[PDB]
Design a protein around this ligand. Structure first.
Ligand code: X9H
Length: 307
């Protein structure tokens, strides 16, 4: 394989100002704040993320593994690691995405989201995933909760805690035990713990279903242990109301038993771009046609602060 020359930036604690808490949950604890690289008259809004646990050595081992992957990606639809802060438990720093995750976004703004925005997000998520496929990255946890919203018109993929790099001739990742989002992974992943770029496509299919249902829960009700038996009977997630058969067929295609028969990310880009050019022909939404701080002089988004 090729040598990974990504730069792992280490950030002084004195460089972070106005750290205010952003959220807490299974993702740990996330903070909003400002990163002021010393000297540079720039104030970059950031998000800081640690662990809702203890300075357990194993926690830092997995933190620094997500750091390794996120430090190695550079794409307009993938979140990049700005750096890490070497406190007791390692903190991961990234660009602040002010509108939060796409999952909570579609849930809160159901009555104001048009087909244009929906289809555009589908293009953008597939562009980031296609980039990850170029970098030989199996995300292994694609889901609406793991897509951040910079602006309503610009979303990016995040959360690399399960991501794995495949070898130059390695085609699959065989895993071991551990909590996995079963309602998002392909059948072969649940049965044989096999992960590929085509299993990520299955996860993409569920993620798209999440957007078209405006944030519904996949297999709402069914416990996790029945999913494998349900998918083996041939059952899949239902057609969302706003979804034409054209769109729902793309979802179904992501859920083929044959992983190689599922669409490739580069194709999902093409198909959704076509649909995004006439969005009302493919999504039917009622009313579609009709759908901080005093430190700002030197604020610069992370996308405009380059090495
Ligand atoms: C979708 C549901 C949800 O509750 N999202 C919140 C939690 C997260 C993790 C988050 C981040 C975020 C994601 N990934 C990172 C990787 C390394 C370092 C830091 C992060 C932070 C986030 C960001 N970056 N901006 C805005 N809101 C964010 N949330 C909310």
């Amino acid at each position: 394989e090729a040598p990974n020359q990504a730069l792992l930036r280490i950030l002084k604690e004195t460089e972070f100002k106005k750290i205010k808490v952003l959220g807490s949950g299974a993702f740990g604890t996330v903070y909003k704040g400002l990163w002021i690289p010393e000297g540079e008259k720039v104030k970059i809004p950031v998000a800081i993320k640690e662990l809702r646990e203890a300075t357990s050595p194993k926690a830092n081992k997995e933190i620094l593994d997500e750091a390794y992957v996120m430090a190695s990606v550079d794409n307009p639809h993938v979140c990049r690691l700005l750096g890490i802060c070497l406190t007791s438990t390692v903190q991961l720093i990234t660009q602040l995405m002010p509108f939060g995750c796409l999952l909570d976004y579609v849930r809160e703004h159901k009555d104001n989201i048009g087909s244009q925005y929906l289809l555009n997000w589908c293009v953008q998520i597939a562009k980031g995933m296609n980039y990850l496929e170029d970098r030989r990255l199996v995300h292994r946890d694609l889901a609406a909760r793991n897509v951040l919203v910079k602006t309503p018109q610009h979303v990016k993929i995040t959360d690399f805690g399960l991501a794995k790099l495949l070898g130059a001739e390695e085609k699959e990742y065989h895993a071991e035990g551990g909590k996995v989002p079963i309602k998002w992974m392909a059948l072969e992943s649940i049965l044989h713990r096999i992960y590929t770029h085509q299993s990520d496509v299955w996860s993409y299919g569920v993620t798209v279903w999440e957007l078209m249902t405006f944030g519904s829960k996949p297999y709402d009700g069914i416990p996790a242990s029945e999913i494998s038996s349900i998918l083996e009977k041939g059952e899949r997630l239902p057609q969302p109301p706003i979804c034409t058969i054209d769109v729902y067929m793309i979802m179904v295609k992501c859920w083929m038993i044959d992983a190689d028969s599922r669409p490739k990310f580069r194709e999902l880009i093409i198909e959704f771009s076509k649909m995004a050019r006439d969005p009302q022909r493919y999504l039917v939404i009622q009313g579609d046609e009709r759908m901080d701080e005093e430190d700002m002089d030197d604020v610069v988004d992370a996308d405009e602060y380059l090495i």
